[PDB]
């Protein structure tokens, strides 16, 4: 019932968001088996070492932890413009 709304609409939203100016990293290659992030540091002979990606655990921002349960509302309790009857 909702798959068209995902593939035939939201997918374009991903396709355009991917070209946004600030989405500069390569997040994922489509292959779980082999993909690893490119990993960088600012670093000096003087001794500084600053990884861009690093694991510090849960942060104040609330971006780090992921509740996967979010998928349920997306299926079982969310309307879409495509579904449904016609909407601009």
């Amino acid at each position: 019932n909702i798959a068209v709304a995902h593939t035939d609409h939201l997918s374009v939203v991903y396709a355009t968001m991917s070209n946004f100016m600030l989405n500069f990293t390569n997040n994922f290659s489509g292959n779980h088996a082999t993909f690893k992030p490119d990993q960088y540091v600012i670093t000096s002979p003087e001794g500084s070492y600053k990884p861009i990606i690093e694991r510090q655990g849960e942060t104040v921002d609330g971006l780090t932890i992921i509740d996967t349960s979010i998928v349920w509302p997306i299926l079982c309790q969310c309307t879409y413009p495509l579904v449904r009857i016609m909407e601009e």
Binding site: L82, V83, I85, M86
Partner: protein
Amino acid sequence: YGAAVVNIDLNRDFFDTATGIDLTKGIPLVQDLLVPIGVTAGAEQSAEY
């Protein structure tokens, strides 16, 4: 005498408005049946055919 032109139309008396059909345009046109999604308003009209 004087009949300008004679067409062979679908019978409105048979395909009545009770059928939902609208034959006045020269084609059947049932509204709100196979309407397309994701298009601007008025783009639905061809599917009425």
